[PDB]
RNA sequence: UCUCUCUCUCUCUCUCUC
RNA sequence: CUCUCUCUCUC
RNA sequence: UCUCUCUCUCUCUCUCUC
RNA sequence: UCUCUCUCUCUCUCUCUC
């Protein structure tokens, strides 16, 4: 049993230290310095070059048909250098092949998909904590407040069963509704090879979405979606239902902080062996990784570096919909709102002006550290039944509605709402855990927070 | 995402390119020179030369029952030319199915009726900002002081949907209650094939007016109104309560410039593809199409200029029932209230004495530019729950009033009166969104106004 | 008479003003 | 009470204007049709014009017959078999009319107003009319219920559009049949209680339940109704409990509402009279429709070789919805034997299209009560408590202690007449 | 009624819509396999035609056929024989059609969309063919049946893609040949009724049962077959009790749908003909397929010394699903006297490929009949309490031992020994003329075999 | 604009252990 | 429940 | 000669460039 | 080799000339 964790541990690592070496190899090319090798629109450029390089369709596509005053078969993006203290922007032309003969020679001669997918749910993280999806939200026919599950929504589809793991329920949900939707314009949809090819991409995300969710009526109620052969209003509007009802009876989304590859990189460089060390996405590592790093930033004028950096901090730590005060206990200091961070995003554009930008150190850095879950709360596990040890009359009890449950109308619809009723926005789920301090390696000492004092806000999107 | 507000904007820039060329064609068939083809009074002429020749269903009475007087296959209008410094007027007549003939050829062929609702609401918003309806408001029952819910009462039938979403709540409470007035008067209204109808027509309207509102207490209740076989006195009285809480619990009525074709005309004329840039009726083209173009006027004796470019200004822009505050910060120049204006309204009647009558530049220029809003503020969006990310023991919170009253006494006055209660004119809405400079075309920085200062006038009639 | 309340055309800030007490004393 | 006599004198012209419009507009129909006072007082008649108003105000078939019509009939005309004496024999022609100057006909008699009132009730007296005459085994045993129980099919005929007033006269069979087929038509089809369109039919079945469970009387039979009710999709299981409740019916009866609506002839024949209800008002379930039938005289189309007096007695049946009533009773009230349905030497009352209308002589119909009572919307008196409680009951047990049958001299139905008791049955 | 009336109108639209698509697509498949009218109006060429539909729609076979492809045949082509008159001569040709351009036509035909309807009444048509042609005693043996019950062997060349709508045309002894293969499997496979599959078994072997339950008429009969049902791990006493339902079935007859369907050169003819199904409407158990039959011309392939009559008589029989109905009755009806099947002097209507297409000829099939009747989905063969009207103070009686009395094998033998062949069933209901298009009319018949198989 | 007392004289079903 | 309901329908 | 109350780590691979 | 926090864009078509 911990063989097996100190495996993947030790597989994890080995991603990580592709990511950084290649991090490495990139920075060597480019002729840049170590404060332009630590800036993170620096790297944000470097891992999109390595993202378009080995988009495989997408690069077939493009050779079939060109871009319009672009060579195919070359990358780019903006790279910006310190000249007498003044910054400017670059656009360096790289092959698509030499960038993966690069990557490739990163991971030891393999296409490490892994590191790539990494690096993509870095960026989906940094997109969920930067920019809002309500316009596609409202166009598919969602209330736009549903923005709490709508984590993971720029995933790309390369990504797989590793980046669909961190996609949230109303991202799936979005999915298969614009799947219902073309099915619904055009009868042709669905028949055919395609037809084929489709039906089993809605049967793998309905079951993916499936076990996302944690109640057996939710469950249920996919799973009746999923059997229709020729799903349309009826199943849009049920999926409409169970996406609302993931507000309160929340899904299984999983959580995992992924560090800019610059981090990585930096970390590379020191000395620091990911291999024999270990690494998880979920525990420690990324927090001790962040806490003796150094990042700079692009700070545009008029704008509050602290602002920006907590922005990086959530992106980092995947903590863009998670409770104000919980992420500020962890932080330390006040993670405000989004309406209130006098800040754009973190990618510079091209027009902007490259004369007024100054650079700032971004502050990555928390007081305590908690572990990242996968479970979204109790939904309403444990001892359901007694096994008697002393000869005493007594009863015998057991929870015999979970018993029985497991053993057994067909409108699960009023169940849900049932369900959902019975719940109150005070209950406490994930009891006797708490967030441990840095120095608490192997997560002993927990610490409760006690949040009873006056309110502060809690929805990071309100 | 961005393909489709692409080809939304090339569809509103053909619009607007067909509006232009045509001007241009008429000028031409006219033969007025620049200044007289860029007088306001000449293309309000024009437009109401091409609304009188496609008004289907009026000439179609006409040629029935002819007019005293008037051939009933031509239109016409005042035009004003200037010789030897001094204005006159001429009535010159054009055959309807030339004016037809010359708009489609305008059009490409294509009798393009989102031109003609487009020139319909440029008229409707100019006789907002410059007559008042309180006659029609009195005799259909209702107070003559919800004149703000009024925009859009001058629109013909034949506008449509797309029209439908500029009239605001109180036409269409004005219409429905003449609808109930003409079921109250006659019991033979809702009977027989013109009742059936009619009967459509009434369900429409008030679908329209429920996506109108915004909280569910006003949709329920004008729900109640619909469902009425017989609507009489109670339905009437119900639309008048909802007019009169549409004045603190607004609606969504959607505001956009139309400008006039003198404007558009000189724009195609100069050279401006509004097919390959594209044109926004809610954004920066408007403004940018105001800035750099130059409108004369006819000018009464004894009047100021300056208040009938505003009053030009304010039609154009749609900010008749606008905070005279707001506008003044966009316009930079103080906009006087109507009672205040020393200038009647912009068209000439035929019994002027057109000897003293001079002419004069219009400012129809803004320092800011800001977006334009369907919505009428917030009621009392976002985020409304949690999803956690750190394995803390924390409550979890969500908005469980918002969630469940998705999911769910009939009497829903006192509702709406304890909502309207509950508000205060102090609150802000729209949080976070400013007014633009002209030359922040992507609309990045927003400025936003402090209104806290002495106090001005705030209400356009008042 | 008048105008008792503002309709929204310009997506800014600003308070939305109307007069509170004429509107409400139709409702007592 | 001393309250409610004011509430009871209301209801009474309310009815009252109604039974006017219905003969006001009989009157119309009959001077509109040509009828003469013998023709217009024929019941053969009466059912054709009461027939022609229902289906011209039946808004949802005449919408699908302008949809999709017919073959050789415009979906824009009704009419029925007019039946004219000249010459002392009997012909048929067939009228035609638009439905919309039918309905012009009928606003205009109600001052107009549509008056669905007197729509119902002509449709309540057709539904009475039908169960007092033919019996419908074939329903009971295609929707897979027993076909004995034909004692609670009371007002199986009735459409949909009869709402509230219909359901009230309705009987436990019925109401059970149309869940029935509910369920079947959920079961075979999975779309079913799914999408908008089963939200609607939800609401619908949870509507005719509610209905259903008010219509018992035993409390255990409230809660199975109840949960039944409460199935999200029901399915077999919901099949058997509503059969086992049918079955409950037959000895713990619920709570079906009577009432005699008379055919539309006696009330023109009334109005014609000077008769006005609005001032006297009138009652469904009090003395009035048997005054009315006493100085009232209408006349009915005899096939050769039957029995007058066994037609007259199917209409006096059918008047005061006594069809599955017992004999004792109605033979009591009536004064002259009834005699079950087995052995009528007669036909239904309306003559088909393929019958020669030409060996068929006219009788007058003996619709005179020696007694008369006023019509009840009460019975008598988990599942093995059902079970149990039907055990425990007795076909002896008396119902209605102290109450009994008036005189027609007696219009204040003071003085009861107890009666004192070989058949029972009229189905059997 | 009054309300069903609606409900009637409906389900007519419903299946003329089905008949429409049918004579649609069977007009569009002639022109593109190029058919003059003689050979469109050839049953043998609409018979490959349907086939074609019904293999291209086989989701599960075309499956396995990828999976596992059969020797020079390639899962995605199907086809069947095509005859066509040259010169006067009559040849045949083998013609291969994609699967998926057979599919686009089909949906085409029907609006777009799949209607399976009108697959599953094509595939009850070939049924009802395959019942009054050939008899299926070697698989009644073979399953342990006593070969004698094939009066209940109604459709049991029915594939299993034919649910619920192939269900109810179904028989009883059908449906126990069904029941009794699940149990023979059970018992020669241990893993049977276990596992994952087991379940899925054990849920189609419930569903089969209760359709099966709803067939018969008798208590008896259904409280038996309620039994058989709730037997966890069925073996030889399910098996010969199921046997005992079969036996009683003879006397105790099932509810047996019986729907007349045509081949889809009477649909495409009349679909040419201008004739709207969707609009007049259509039904298989009225006079709608009597009425289109007499209309009707329908030629068939001949082989040598073989009768034309009986033939004719044969595709007469399988057109209104007659097979097992009594020759008296059907004699009656069509006005010819119908003859045994051991008295018939031809072999099947599908032809077969070693058969020397060169000495065959084409007859026109008489597929007209003197009188119309209705078909039944019933076999063969009062009020008990009361509810009161007035406020009386009687007692309301009641049939006490007969409410309370309804709250296995011995029941059933004695049922049947009460039965005779002489009961009259149907009773006041006869048959009427083709003119008499309402059914107003009867015309009780009055009647020397009486088996088609005997 | 139909018809009928008393076992289906018309009320389909939108395909398969895929 | 010896009268005290009804303005119609998945329209 | 080790550590721990209370599954969330990891391979899952992509209908289409979108 | 692109850009963006926060639906306001667009087709909706008209009981009657009013
Ligand atoms: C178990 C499992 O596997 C099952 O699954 C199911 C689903 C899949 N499918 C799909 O996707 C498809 C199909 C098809 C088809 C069809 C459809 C429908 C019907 O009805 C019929 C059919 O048929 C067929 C098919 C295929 C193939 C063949 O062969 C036959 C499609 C088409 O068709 O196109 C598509 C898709
Ligand atoms: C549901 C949906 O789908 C549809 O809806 C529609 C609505 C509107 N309209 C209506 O409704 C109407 C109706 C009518 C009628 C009537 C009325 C009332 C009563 O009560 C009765 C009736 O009837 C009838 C009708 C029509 C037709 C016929 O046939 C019959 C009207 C009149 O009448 O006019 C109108 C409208
Ligand atoms: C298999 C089951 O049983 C489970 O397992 C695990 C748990 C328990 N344990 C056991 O069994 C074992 C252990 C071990 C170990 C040890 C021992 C001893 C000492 O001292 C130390 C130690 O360490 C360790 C272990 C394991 C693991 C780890 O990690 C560590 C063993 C050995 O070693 O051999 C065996 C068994
Ligand atoms: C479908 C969903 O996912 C959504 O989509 C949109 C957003 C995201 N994106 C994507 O996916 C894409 C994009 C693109 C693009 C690009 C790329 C690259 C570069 O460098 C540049 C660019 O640009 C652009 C675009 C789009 C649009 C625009 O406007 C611009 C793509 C291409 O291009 O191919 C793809 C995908």
């Known amino acids: ?74 990358t780019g993006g903006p790279i910006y250098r310190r000249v007498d203290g003044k910054w400017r922007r670059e656009l360096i032309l790289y092959d698509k092949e030499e960038i993966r003969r690069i990557w490739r020679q990163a991971n030891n001669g393999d296409d490490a998909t892994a590191g790539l997918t990494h690096m993509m749910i870095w960026h989906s993280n940094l997109n969920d904590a930067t920019y809002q999806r309500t316009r596609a939200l409202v166009r598919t026919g969602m209330d736009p407040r549903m923005c709490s599950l709508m984590q993971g929504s720029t995933l790309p589809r390369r990504s797989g069963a590793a980046g669909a793991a961190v996609k949230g329920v109303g991202t799936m949900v979005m999915e298969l509704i614009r799947m219902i939707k073309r099915g619904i314009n055009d009868r042709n949809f669905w028949r055919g090879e395609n037809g084929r090819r489709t039906r089993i991409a809605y049967e793998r995300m309905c079951n993916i979405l499936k076990g996302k969710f944690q109640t057996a009526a939710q469950r249920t109620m996919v799973d009746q979606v999923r059997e229709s052969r020729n799903p349309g209003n009826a199943e849009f509007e049920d999926l409409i239902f169970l996406a609302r009802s993931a507000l309160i009876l929340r899904g299984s989304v999983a959580h995992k902080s992924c560090l800019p590859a610059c981090v990585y990189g930096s970390a590379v460089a020191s000395g620091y062996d990911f291999e024999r060390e270990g690494y998880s996405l979920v525990g420690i590592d990324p927090f001790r990784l962040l806490q003796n790093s150094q990042v700079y930033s692009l700070i545009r004028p008029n704008e509050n570096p602290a602002h920006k950096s907590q922005l990086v901090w959530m992106a980092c730590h995947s903590a863009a919909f998670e409770d104000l005060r919980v992420s500020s206990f962890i932080r330390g200091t006040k993670v405000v709102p989004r309406g209130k961070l006098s800040t754009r995003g973190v990618q510079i554009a091209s027009n902007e002006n490259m004369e007024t930008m100054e650079s700032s150190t971004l502050e990555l850095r928390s007081r305590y550290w908690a572990i990242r879950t996968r479970s979204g709360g109790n939904t309403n596990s444990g001892q359901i039944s007694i096994q008697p040890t002393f000869s005493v009359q007594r009863n015998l009890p057991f929870d015999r509605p979970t018993i029985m449950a497991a053993f057994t109308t067909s409108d699960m619809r009023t169940e849900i709402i049932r369900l959902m009723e019975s719940a109150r926005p005070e209950d406490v789920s994930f009891q006797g855990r708490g967030v441990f301090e840095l120095s608490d390696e192997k997560a002993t000492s927990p610490i409760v927070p006690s949040f009873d004092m006056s309110n502060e806000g809690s929805y990071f999107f309100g």
């Open 1 to 74: 049993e911990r063989q097996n964790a100190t495996e993947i541990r030790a597989s994890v690592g080995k991603m990580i230290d592709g990511i950084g070496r290649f991090y490495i190899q990139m920075c060597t090319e480019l002729k840049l310095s170590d404060y332009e090798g630590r800036l993170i629109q620096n790297s944000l450029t470097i891992e999109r070059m390595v993202l378009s390089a080995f988009d495989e369709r997408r690069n077939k596509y493009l050779e079939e048909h060109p871009s319009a005053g672009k060579d195919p078969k070359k």
